[PDB]
Structure 1
Amino acid sequence: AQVDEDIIVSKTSLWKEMQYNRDIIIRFKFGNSIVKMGGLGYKWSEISYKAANYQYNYLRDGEQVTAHTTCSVNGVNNFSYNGGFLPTDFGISRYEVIKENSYVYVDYWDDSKAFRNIVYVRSLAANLNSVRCTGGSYHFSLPVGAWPVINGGAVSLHFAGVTLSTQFTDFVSLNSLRFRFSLTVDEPPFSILRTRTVNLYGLPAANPNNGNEYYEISGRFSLISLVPTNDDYQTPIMNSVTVRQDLERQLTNLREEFNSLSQEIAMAQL
């Protein structure tokens, strides 16, 4: 049996049931979303995770395969560092952290033949190997005073269930394989400089990438999917999104209000 074996489980006039057994490498990238509150600038409203996409290409047994990965997080805890109510003290209203109770979803899609018309899937199984994700240092750059840095944090992604999924983006709409990863916090705690809380585990959402362009996981899967008989097909994967038009409308309404207010401020000042 080959590492990249292909088998026709069943065939008919218009359809077939191809079994694909591929060895893959999953290169994903955590997505952080940092927003700083107004005022003096010592208060950070949210430090939250975000579904992040990474598009790469790697080397199969002699083949160049373009892959698209999308990492999101499920059930992250909402912690918060608070020092005082005045605008003088550093504060984070809320920041998301990955913990034992949470899960990490990674959706992978490949240019290979195993994904060309993937809609239906038998017996989806895969073996992956765990990985260490260590959080980096992020500097809360204040205009005066110190620069409290959040540091530490480390988790171990351990493989768990696999299902189908979809990868929607402005550019593509892929039918992908989703692997969930349970978690086990590693040893190094995580803490902030000039902060009361210490000796805590997890992975803060500040810079979970921690310098690395990606976290690499080697794995392989085994699926059987209906694809119609011949191969010269283009199921729609490339996309075109014009979604949340009401959201866009209210966003531009807020922007024009902000521009008018700022112009009024400038006119008053000058």
Structure 2
Amino acid sequence: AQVDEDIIVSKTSLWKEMQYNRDIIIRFKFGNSIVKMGGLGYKWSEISYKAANYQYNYLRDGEQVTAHTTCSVNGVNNFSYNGGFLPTDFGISRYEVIKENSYVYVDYWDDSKAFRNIVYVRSLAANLNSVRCTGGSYHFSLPVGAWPVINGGAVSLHFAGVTLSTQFTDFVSLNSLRFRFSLTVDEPPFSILRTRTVNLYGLPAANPNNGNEYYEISGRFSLISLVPTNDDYQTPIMNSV
């Protein structure tokens, strides 16, 4: 048919809109990919952020909470450096950094009641503690000359929003909750040593973990989902001991 059409697939029902006000500890570790370039081994084609997954668990009013998250970046600036054009010369065709323009995303999920009830939502607000992300050092393994080394990089995460992605594949739902954080740079500036670009504000992808297992953030988690729960009616007349 080529025509407008609506059918009812059921009749009315009953739903409440309950409020779940829990608290949350999201911990996540960045991911970086470094790749060579066909040659003597002085041109690095890519050093860029990459999707990094990580699982963990913790305690929250006793009930052990297992959590599984994956972090990535968006709006990433892409800088490039060319210390020289010879085969012997050193170069980075593209290295990723994060600035005020950039956002950082962390998908998170949990098998608790409050998170499992996030299928329908009227409003989802939350406040988080801002934290500092610092960049470690990376020795550019170079088969001649003095190794360049990258250093520094410091930013701060501020809360920007929460999102619910929902993929559909033949009536079944594959959902994912995501936290979007805005960035605000901070001293000390990062710099690739023995190189032109020095005293730049940002955070490169070379060594974002800084030797830390994870970057942690705490906060409160307010959910206003629409439960299917009854109101003790719609239940047979001999509903009793």
TM-score over 0.5 for the pair = yes
Q: Which has the larger radius of gyration?
A: 2
Distance 1:60 1:233, change over 3 A: farther
Distance 1:49 1:232, change over 3 A: farther
CA distance in 1, matches of 2:183, 2:35: 26
Report how far residue 212 of structure 1 moved: 0.8
CA distance in 2, matches of 1:64, 1:2: 54
Whether the 8 Å CA contact 2:123–2:225 is kept in 1: the answer is: no
Report how far residue 236 of structure 1 moved: 31
Deviations 1:159-186 (A, max 9, x none): 1222223699999996343221111111
Whether the 8 Å CA contact 1:128–1:218 is kept in 2: the answer is: yes
Identity %: 99
Report how far residue 133 of structure 1 moved: 0.2
Mean Cα deviation higher: 93-102 or 168-177? 168-177
Whether the 8 Å CA contact 1:71–1:105 is kept in 2: the answer is: yes
Deviations 1:211-249 (A, max 9, x none): 1111100011111223433899999999xxxxxxxxxxx
CA distance in 2, matches of 1:180, 1:214: 18
Distance 1:174 1:143, change over 3 A: farther
Whether the 8 Å CA contact 1:7–1:18 is kept in 2: the answer is: no
CA distance in 2, matches of 1:237, 1:140: 76
Deviations 1:25-59 (A, max 9, x none): 01011111111112111110011111211111011
Distance 1:181 1:144, change over 3 A: same
Distance 1:154 1:236, change over 3 A: farther
Mean Cα deviation higher: 215-224 or 174-183? 174-183
Distance 1:171 1:159, change over 3 A: farther
CA distance in 2, matches of 1:47, 1:233: 61
CA distance in 2, matches of 1:97, 1:3: 51
CA distance in 1, matches of 2:170, 2:138: 29
Question: What TM-score, normalized to structure 2?
Answer: 0.83
Q: How many residues align?
A: 240
Mean Cα deviation higher: 140-149 or 214-223? 140-149
Question: What TM-score, normalized to structure 1?
Answer: 0.75
Structure number with the higher helix fraction is 1
CA distance in 2, matches of 1:29, 1:7: 48
Report how far residue 156 of structure 1 moved: 0.5
Alignment of 1:170-189 (within 5 A): 175-189=175-189
CA distance in 2, matches of 1:236, 1:63: 34
Distance 1:7 1:228, change over 3 A: farther
* 1:156 partner SS: strand
Distance 1:169 1:221, change over 3 A: farther
Distance 1:5 1:76, change over 3 A: farther
Distance 1:195 1:165, change over 3 A: same
> What RMSD, in angstroms, separates the aligned Cα atoms of the two structures?
12.5
* 1:160 partner SS: strand
Mean Cα deviation higher: 16-25 or 2-11? 2-11
Whether the 8 Å CA contact 1:10–1:17 is kept in 2: the answer is: no
CA distance in 2, matches of 1:212, 1:4: 57
CA distance in 2, matches of 1:185, 1:3: 54
* 2:147 partner SS: coil
What are the ranges of 5 or more consecutive residues in structure 1 without an aligned counterpart? Answer: 239-268
Whether the 8 Å CA contact 1:5–1:20 is kept in 2: the answer is: no
CA distance in 1, matches of 2:191, 2:236: 47
Q: Name which structure has the greater RCO, CA cutoff 8 Å, separation 6+.
A: 2
Whether the 8 Å CA contact 1:12–1:229 is kept in 2: the answer is: no
CA distance in 2, matches of 1:188, 1:170: 51
Whether the 8 Å CA contact 2:152–2:188 is kept in 1: the answer is: yes
